[PDB]
Design a binder for these strands. Structure first.
Lengths: 45, 232, 205, 112, 139, 51, 121
RNA sequence: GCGAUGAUCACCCGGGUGGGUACAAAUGGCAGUCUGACAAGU
């Protein structure tokens, strides 16, 4: 019903940080993506 | 163990782990349709079989990896699949819709058709229609109203095939997902120019285009255009 | 009177339309949006059900070819009593064929009628009492494959999966027949052990 | 004083228990092509073979035939109604008469 | 001839290993993603987060984007290192395949010289050596 | 699947164990496969069986 | 000969048969349906030429199935006797294949014809 | 109200991991389907 209080949009939004924090671990780290990207082009080409 | 997780679009998952893959739940456990890998995982615990979805073999799967905002293919929905060469992609679409949903697979060529039939026996919710899509009136009996129309037909006049099928079977505000190959339509111009024309031709057919997505690296000179069928 | 011919996997349905000229109304979409409106506007005049799959396959091919079947003819013959009634058909081919039957029906096939069929098919399970949506799928599934078997020219005498089983079964029978023969030779040989050397064939033994 | 008859009988008895199962499984497959769901209805293989000997063609469905197959085993499981309703609507592709002849004879073999 | 057979069999194994490996791996999409908005105003205040209703970090993930509402024991570095090996392993399969392809082709080129016919050696300025056969029909 | 195979494979279809051992160890490959039991091959004698 | 499709016109056949002759002299040509079938399996075929007058046509009809599977261009030419002479042999040839070689001296001509065959499909 | 016609002699938190024997299935792996223009006669 969109009746959120000032407390409401804090707890739910904490969950956003919690889950988004979790998915980053699966997302993998950026420096690896630099190497993984190069390998991807060679295999694809 | 592999950690199966939910995905944005219902009926689709990702089998994260040491190897991460786009995955769908198997409707008929104990067999693979086209030799794809299967993964079974216990959930409270009962092991539930899953099938891998290869983006390079299915263009719809290439749409998922591209990050399509909206897919009208969802559990418990009626889907009309045009250009169903075999069960390579229809099986996965059948998995997404689930037992409650139904898939209307339309194909013209006989040799892929016999392959399609042999799969349809294993999947009760797939209704294979061996007929030419350019004349949808021929198979009007077997198809009721459908929530979405997916078309992988690689024909120059494809936008007309979408028109006739959408007009007869697609519901108002229904789904339209089109896979376009530029090289078939016009190889002299760049692919972007071809895609702009295809969007416009759909617009002339009371289909509002919502989003467009190009399918690299999975395919070259291909894009998926999603639109909504606005009858009003 | 206005009539609508609806073709289904379960059978033929004749819907009597209240207004004679519904198909010239520009507000069909709004008029037919809900099942209640559909039921009020359209009433089942006659319904011919497919008794068996073989009949259904024959009926399906007539519609695909655009030919009037005997069951459809008889179903139209019942409603003949209404003088000067319009009949609405989805296909122009089927409309033309019905016209040649000489029937007292003004047969009309127009793009405007397309919307009428859209609403009818959308609420068809509710329009047709006694058969659920699940059943309607089940007849459609079986009918589709049988049509598919016909179009693909499938013949029961040209399936190779039987060959692969028969050869495998034939090898299995050779193995099993051999073990039983040896058991009989050694079990009966106790009574008369000299037979095996003389006669070697298991069946003759 | 002979006890080797016992040794022959046991060596044969378990062999029959293997062959009866192996052949019965094949009978399920072959008739599975013509009527795949029925193999699910009657899991007990010996009952399945006797039923298949009766219902050779799933097209043939009569009320008297329903009673006759209802006499086979009991209607407590309800399989008698399921097969008649399910034979009407099924996915099994019809196999040739010669193929059916093999199934019944091979099913007859499992009976012997 | 036996040398040619030996190399080709190795190349065929490598190709099949490459195909199985590639199916194992998952490649992130790199494709343009356009959205259609009717009004010029809806363009100017367009924002990816608003359209997808998801956090800005979560937007740039094309494979699996999730709206905020859905959002509402192996070390990561080791798992990172295990992905890259799986990627490098498939790459090495491709490199081995190309090398075996080149070795076979040079082998087949030599085998043609052994066969009957009239041929002339032609040498380019770069020094590449090739043979041109005369236009004589095989009897 | 058989129809899409070349005639060379059909010759040595049933003898993969001998074929791939020979191919990898640089030895001569089999020449009959499963066709050895056809009537026409039986009529042939000596090296004519291979032909 | 309805099954033979796509069938090249006279102007395109001369272009195809010209490349087949050049490939033969460079030993870049595989002759015969069985030997052409292999090149598809090894993935070394630029495109496949078939003869429409082959009788029965089915003996070469497996190649379209393999070619569409592997995404290799294929085209039919009206005469198998003419194909055999272009190949440079004393017998009629119902099928031939151009082997892939990116260092070949006739690479440009093969690709020029290959593009035309793609347009035909 | 005994007995030589035979006494005695893995792990972890009610729950889960570890090991063994037998059978069956797998479109799971090993695993990749030989060569390619001459030969026989006078």
């Amino acid at each position: 019903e969109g009746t959120l209080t000032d407390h409401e949009r804090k707890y739910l939004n904490k969950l956003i940080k919690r889950n988004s924090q979790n998915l980053r671990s699966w997302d993998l780290e950026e420096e690896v993506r630099d190497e993984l990207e190069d390998i991807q082009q060679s295999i694809l080409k | 163990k592999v950690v199966i997780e939910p995905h944005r679009h219902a009926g689709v998952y990702i089998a994260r782990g040491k190897e991460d893959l786009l995955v769908t739940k198997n409707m008929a456990p104990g067999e693979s349709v086209y030799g794809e890998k299967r993964i079974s995982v216990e959930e409270p615990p009962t092991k539930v079989e899953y099938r891998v979805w290869n983006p390079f073999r299915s263009k719809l799967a290439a749409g998922i990896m591209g990050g399509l905002d909206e897919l009208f293919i969802a559990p418990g929905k009626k889907v009309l699949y045009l250009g169903a060469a075999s069960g390579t992609s229809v099986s996965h679409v059948s998995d997404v819709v689930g037992p409650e949903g139904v898939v209307y697979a339309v194909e013209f060529s006989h040799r892929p058709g016999r392959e399609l039939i042999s799969m349809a026996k294993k999947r009760p919710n797939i209704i294979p229609i061996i007929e030419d899509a350019r004349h949808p009136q021929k198979y009007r009996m077997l198809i009721g109203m459908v929530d979405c129309v997916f078309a992988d037909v690689a024909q120059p006049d494809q936008a007309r095939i979408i028109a006739l099928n959408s007009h007869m079977f697609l519901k108002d505000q229904g789904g339209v997902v089109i896979s376009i190959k530029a090289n078939c339509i016009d190889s002299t111009v760049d692919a972007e120019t071809v895609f702009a024309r295809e969007v416009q031709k759909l617009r002339e057919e009371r289909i509002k285009p919502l989003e467009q997505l190009t399918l690299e690296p999975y395919e070259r000179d291909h894009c998926i255009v999603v639109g909504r069928y606005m009858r009003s | 009177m206005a009539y609508v011919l609806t073709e289904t996997s379960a059978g033929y349905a004749l819907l009597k339309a209240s207004d004679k000229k519904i198909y010239k109304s520009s507000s069909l979409i709004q008029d037919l949006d809900s099942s209640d409106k559909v039921l009020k506007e359209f009433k089942i005049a006659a319904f011919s059900k497919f008794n068996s799959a073989a009949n259904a396959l024959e009926e399906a091919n007539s519609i695909i070819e655009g030919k009037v079947s005997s069951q459809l003819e008889k179903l139209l013959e019942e409603i003949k009593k209404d003088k000067k009634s319009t009949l609405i058909v989805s296909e122009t081919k089927l409309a033309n064929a019905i016209n040649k039957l000489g029937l007292n029906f003004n047969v009309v096939s127009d793009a405007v009628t397309l919307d009428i069929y859209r609403a009818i098919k959308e609420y068809l399970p509710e329009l047709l009492p006694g058969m659920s949506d699940n059943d309607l799928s089940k007849m459609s599934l079986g009918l589709a494959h049988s049509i598919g078997r016909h179009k693909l020219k499938f013949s029961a005498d040209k399936v190779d999966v039987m060959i692969i089983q028969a050869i495998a079964l034939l090898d299995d029978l050779d193995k099993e027949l051999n073990t039983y023969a040896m058991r009989c030779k050694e079990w009966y040989g106790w009574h008369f052990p000299e037979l095996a050397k003389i006669v070697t064939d298991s069946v003759a033994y | 004083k002979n006890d080797n008859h016992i040794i022959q009988a046991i060596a044969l008895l378990d062999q029959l228990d293997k062959d009866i199962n192996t052949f019965a499984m094949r009978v399920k497959e072959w008739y599975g092509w013509h009527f795949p769901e029925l193999a699910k209805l009657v899991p007990d293989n010996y009952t399945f073979a006797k039923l298949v000997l009766f219902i050779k063609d799933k097209a043939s469905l009569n009320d008297d035939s329903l009673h006759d197959l209802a006499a086979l085993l009991n209607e407590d499981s309800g399989i008698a109604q399921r097969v008649i309703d399910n034979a009407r609507i099924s996915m099994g592709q019809d196999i040739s008469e010669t193929d059916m002849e093999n199934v019944c004879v091979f099913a007859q073999r499992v009976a012997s | 001839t036996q040398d040619s057979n030996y190399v080709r069999t190795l190349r065929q194994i490598e190709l099949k290993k490459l195909e199985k490996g590639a199916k194992q791996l998952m490649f992130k999409s790199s494709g343009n993603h356009t959205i259609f908005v009717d009004s010029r105003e809806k363009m100017n205040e367009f924002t990816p987060e608003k359209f997808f209703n998801t956090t800005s970090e979560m937007v740039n993930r094309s494979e699996n984007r999730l709206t905020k509402d859905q959002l509402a024991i192996m070390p990561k570095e080791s798992l990172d290192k295990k992905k890259l090996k799986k990627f490098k392993q498939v790459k090495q399969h491709l490199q081995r395949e190309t090398q075996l392809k080149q070795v076979q082709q040079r082998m087949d080129a030599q085998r043609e010289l052994l066969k009957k016919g009239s041929k002339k050696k032609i040498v380019d300025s770069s020094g590449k050596i090739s043979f041109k056969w005369k236009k004589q029909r095989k009897r | 699947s058989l129809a899409k195979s070349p005639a060379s494979t059909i010759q040595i279809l049933g003898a993969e164990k001998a074929l791939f051992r020979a191919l990898k160890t640089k030895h001569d490959t089999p020449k009959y496969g499963l066709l050895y039991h056809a009537s026409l091959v039986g009529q042939a004698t000596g090296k004519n069986k291979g032909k | 000969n309805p099954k033979a499709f796509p069938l090249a016109d006279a102007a395109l056949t001369q272009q195809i048969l010209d490349v087949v002759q050049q490939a033969a002299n460079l030993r870049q040509l595989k002759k015969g349906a069985n030997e052409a079938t292999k090149t598809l399996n090894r993935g070394i075929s630029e495109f496949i030429i078939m003869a429409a007058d082959c009788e029965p046509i089915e003996i070469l009809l497996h190649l379209p199935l393999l070619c569409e599977d592997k995404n290799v261009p294929y085209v039919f030419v009206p005469s198998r006797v003419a194909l055999g002479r272009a190949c440079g042999v004393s017998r009629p040839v119902i099928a031939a294949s151009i082997t892939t070689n990116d260092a070949s001296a006739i690479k440009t001509q093969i690709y020029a014809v290959k593009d035309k065959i793609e347009t035909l499909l």
